[PDB]
Scaffold this active site. Structure first.
Site, PDB file in Angstrom:
ATOM      1  N   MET A  83      37.889  44.336  40.837  1.00  0.00           N
ATOM      2  CA  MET A  83      39.382  44.034  40.984  1.00  0.00           C
ATOM      3  C   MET A  83      38.724  42.735  42.404  1.00  0.00           C
ATOM      4  O   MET A  83      39.847  42.777  43.455  1.00  0.00           O
ATOM      5  CB  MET A  83      39.585  45.047  42.119  1.00  0.00           C
ATOM      6  CG  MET A  83      40.108  46.417  41.218  1.00  0.00           C
ATOM      7  SD  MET A  83      41.419  45.858  40.337  1.00  0.00           S
ATOM      8  CE  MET A  83      40.846  45.427  38.027  1.00  0.00           C
ATOM      9  N   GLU A 128      40.458  49.847  23.943  1.00  0.00           N
ATOM     10  CA  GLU A 128      39.511  49.603  25.688  1.00  0.00           C
ATOM     11  C   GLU A 128      38.388  49.823  24.530  1.00  0.00           C
ATOM     12  O   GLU A 128      37.588  49.475  24.872  1.00  0.00           O
ATOM     13  CB  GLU A 128      40.153  49.652  26.736  1.00  0.00           C
ATOM     14  CG  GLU A 128      41.365  48.864  26.917  1.00  0.00           C
ATOM     15  CD  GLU A 128      41.626  48.271  28.602  1.00  0.00           C
ATOM     16  OE1 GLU A 128      41.618  49.758  29.166  1.00  0.00           O
ATOM     17  OE2 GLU A 128      41.957  47.572  28.823  1.00  0.00           O
ATOM     18  N   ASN A 151      35.820  52.194  30.682  1.00  0.00           N
ATOM     19  CA  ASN A 151      35.067  51.146  29.815  1.00  0.00           C
ATOM     20  C   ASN A 151      33.521  51.179  30.321  1.00  0.00           C
ATOM     21  O   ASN A 151      33.156  50.687  29.238  1.00  0.00           O
ATOM     22  CB  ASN A 151      36.053  49.760  30.036  1.00  0.00           C
ATOM     23  CG  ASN A 151      37.116  50.115  29.628  1.00  0.00           C
ATOM     24  OD1 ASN A 151      37.252  50.190  28.189  1.00  0.00           O
ATOM     25  ND2 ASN A 151      38.180  49.201  29.738  1.00  0.00           N
ATOM     26  N   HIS A 197      40.840  42.701  29.262  1.00  0.00           N
ATOM     27  CA  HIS A 197      42.237  43.109  30.519  1.00  0.00           C
ATOM     28  C   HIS A 197      43.202  43.843  29.375  1.00  0.00           C
ATOM     29  O   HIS A 197      43.789  43.611  27.500  1.00  0.00           O
ATOM     30  CB  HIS A 197      42.869  41.728  30.136  1.00  0.00           C
ATOM     31  CG  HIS A 197      44.078  41.616  31.182  1.00  0.00           C
ATOM     32  ND1 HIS A 197      44.101  41.696  32.735  1.00  0.00           N
ATOM     33  CD2 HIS A 197      45.464  42.087  30.589  1.00  0.00           C
ATOM     34  CE1 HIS A 197      45.960  41.592  32.665  1.00  0.00           C
ATOM     35  NE2 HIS A 197      46.748  41.610  31.275  1.00  0.00           N
ATOM     36  N   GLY A 254      35.626  53.671  36.537  1.00  0.00           N
ATOM     37  CA  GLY A 254      34.276  53.334  35.207  1.00  0.00           C
ATOM     38  C   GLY A 254      34.443  53.381  33.823  1.00  0.00           C
ATOM     39  O   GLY A 254      33.690  53.812  32.801  1.00  0.00           O
ATOM     40  N   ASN A 259      35.507  39.319  29.586  1.00  0.00           N
ATOM     41  CA  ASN A 259      36.529  40.731  30.832  1.00  0.00           C
ATOM     42  C   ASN A 259      37.324  41.298  29.802  1.00  0.00           C
ATOM     43  O   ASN A 259      37.371  41.242  29.271  1.00  0.00           O
ATOM     44  CB  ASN A 259      36.844  40.203  32.139  1.00  0.00           C
ATOM     45  CG  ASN A 259      38.045  40.971  32.860  1.00  0.00           C
ATOM     46  OD1 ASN A 259      38.144  42.244  33.614  1.00  0.00           O
ATOM     47  ND2 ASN A 259      39.454  40.203  32.144  1.00  0.00           N
ATOM     48  N   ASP A 281      43.388  31.540  36.232  1.00  0.00           N
ATOM     49  CA  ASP A 281      42.758  32.444  35.389  1.00  0.00           C
ATOM     50  C   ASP A 281      43.125  31.949  33.663  1.00  0.00           C
ATOM     51  O   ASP A 281      43.764  30.898  33.383  1.00  0.00           O
ATOM     52  CB  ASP A 281      44.258  33.971  35.056  1.00  0.00           C
ATOM     53  CG  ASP A 281      45.659  32.863  35.354  1.00  0.00           C
ATOM     54  OD1 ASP A 281      45.665  32.191  36.648  1.00  0.00           O
ATOM     55  OD2 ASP A 281      46.299  33.877  34.961  1.00  0.00           O
TER      56      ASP A 281
END
Ligand code: CL
Ligand code: CL
Lengths: 192, 192
Positions: free
Chosen positions: A91, A173, A15, A110, A13, A108, A144
């Site tokens: 995930m 991030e 982020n 990445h 966790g 999201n 995606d």
């Protein structure tokens, strides 16, 4: 009235905790109303609880199918009335069916500069391609790869490993996700 | 003793002129000994001449084959004894045969974050992929695509066109090429 956010995690966790921290600031246009996990052992849960955020675990193994699992999650979301859902190391793949009620509202992060390296091992892949910059992307998740909202780049240094590079991208991030959420809800880097 | 550099161009020579300007500084580890062009109308030539750099034009149409053209260029290079060759908008493909005598010593700048968009229209392509950062790459040219030496990223702003974005990346190219040449011869960007 602030945007209500539910964050999904499956792991430590980092982020998630950055989002929770940024949201404490006066005038930040979102509040974190819950953190959901598919794993009871996810380290992010304890962190969320200590900061006073409600948490919920829905284990896939506790349902007869993936649809019943998404159904329990959607019903639980509905009671929280989120305006924005942020995935932060979750995930599991979301079906189009799950995405529909939150179309355009699921974000999201990445750890690559999409569309480069959209799957796993993004830091090793950047080093294998000999790149001198790497970074991260916040995008929308779509019924995606939905529209990119924000990106950050950091240098790849002589002598980096996947581990050293990942750690640098992770600082980025932490700064990028709050900025994307702030923009949604409301010069140059040289490397040689 | 400074590294002797020959720059190749086919057009206006913006990056050529950036290299010439950076090399004027005391202690800069390279000197520009000539600019070569395959086009007499290339705007970079007049610029090189005004800064006192020797210039040479070899038109493809003046030789019976591409090999005879590369042969004239190699013989001309040999009299200048370059240590480093920089391509700065040169629009002809170099054969492996041409590259061999300068293996590892030929640099090129490309206005994308390689390996993304290695061919043409790089700025439009970044906008079409919805990216929020774009940039440029200096790499070695090899017997497409030798080892990346340096990269720079700049933000893509709301409302950019290929033209506005190209102009921003070009400021970055002006700074990147000298830095790569300096490194060869001798924090983060967020966009939301
Ligand atoms: Cl990795
Ligand atoms: Cl373009």
């Amino acid at each position: 009235k602030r945007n209500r956010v539910v964050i999904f995690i499956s792991g430590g966790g980092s982020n998630m905790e950055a989002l929770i921290r940024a949201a404490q600031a006066p005038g930040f246009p979102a509040e974190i109303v819950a953190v959901f996990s598919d794993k009871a052992e996810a380290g992010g849960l304890a962190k969320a609880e200590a900061a006073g955020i409600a948490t919920q675990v829905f284990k896939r193994k506790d349902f007869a199918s993936k649809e019943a699992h998404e159904d329990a999650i959607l019903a639980a979301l509905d009671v929280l009335k989120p305006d924005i859902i942020c995935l932060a190391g979750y995930m599991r793949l979301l079906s189009g069916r799950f995405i529909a009620p939150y179309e355009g509202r699921i974000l999201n992060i990445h750890p690559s500069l999409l569309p480069l390296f959209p799957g796993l091992h993004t830091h090793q892949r950047a080093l294998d391609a000999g790149m001198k910059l790497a970074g991260c992307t916040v995008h929308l998740v779509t019924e995606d790869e939905g529209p990119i909202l924000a990106q950050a780049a950091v240098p790849v240094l002589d002598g980096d490993t996947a581990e050293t590079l990942a750690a640098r991208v992770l600082k980025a991030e932490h700064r990028l996700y709050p900025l994307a959420l702030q923009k949604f809800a409301a010069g140059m880097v040289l490397s040689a």
